[PDB]
Design a protein around this ligand. Sequence first.
Ligand SMILES: C[C@]12CCc3c(ccc4cc(O)ccc34)[C@@H]1CCC2=O
Ligand SMILES: C[C@]12CCc3c(ccc4cc(O)ccc34)[C@@H]1CCC2=O
Lengths: 120, 123
Amino acid sequence: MNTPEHMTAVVQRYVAALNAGDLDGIVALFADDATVEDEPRSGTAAIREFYANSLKLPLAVELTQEVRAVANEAAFAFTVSFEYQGRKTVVAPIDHFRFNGAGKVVSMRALFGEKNIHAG
Amino acid sequence: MNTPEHMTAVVQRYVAALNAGDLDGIVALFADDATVEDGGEPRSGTAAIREFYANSLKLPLAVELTQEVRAVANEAAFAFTVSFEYQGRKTVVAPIDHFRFNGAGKVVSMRALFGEKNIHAGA
Ligand SMILES: C[C@]12CCc3c(ccc4cc(O)ccc34)[C@@H]1CCC2=O
Ligand SMILES: C[C@]12CCc3c(ccc4cc(O)ccc34)[C@@H]1CCC2=O
């Protein structure tokens, strides 16, 4: 079983690589067979493309509370903000990571609905 | 598909029911065949869910949603605190819960996610 310390550090590395625009660094956290979701995309190529599309605009990302890490899972509340064509948007999801035995993320699901997308 | 408004209302109603010690009001949110799981198997069906919540309600709880609900498709996730005190010693737990809903708008599964670092000794 993964340690909560390890899963928590991975969530912080994920947030860090988003803020730095470090696409390599994001993908390196995932397993070769991981899926991502927010069409559920799978495998390294599809994952890289998912994140490359997100990172067409510079993202400001912040964990807004402590991470919840248990068993082989972590859930975390956060914001992701971007500014383009004179408009700032702040999206407030909750993300859930599942991890494999080797400590890599095998699934991420970002949960948010319309009321969690704020155009201020 | 469920509305996000309905799901969000249900999360709020769940919080309120916990604060009011309203056991039947909590159980009424769930489908007949729902599962609960917290942090060696899920509890399944009405009697087991009732027993799960009756045991939680042995101490007075103060539950607060600490951020907006996330609701989408047939699911909702939410951040909150649960605060209780036993023999003068206070605990604040900070979980994230996830509900799945059936087509009738009842909860078919609740998972509560929290670890040791999410259990805070002291008020
Ligand atoms: C997908 C994502 C969460 C949601 C999200 C992101 C980026 C831009 C978005 C734009 C939206 O209109 C709605 C959601 C997002 C994040 C980038 C990393 C991540 O976890
Ligand atoms: C199970 C629960 C979330 C976690 C939790 C509750 C109550 C007492 C707790 C005590 C703990 O040491 C750890 C977690 C809980 C809530 C009751 C309602 C709910 O969803």
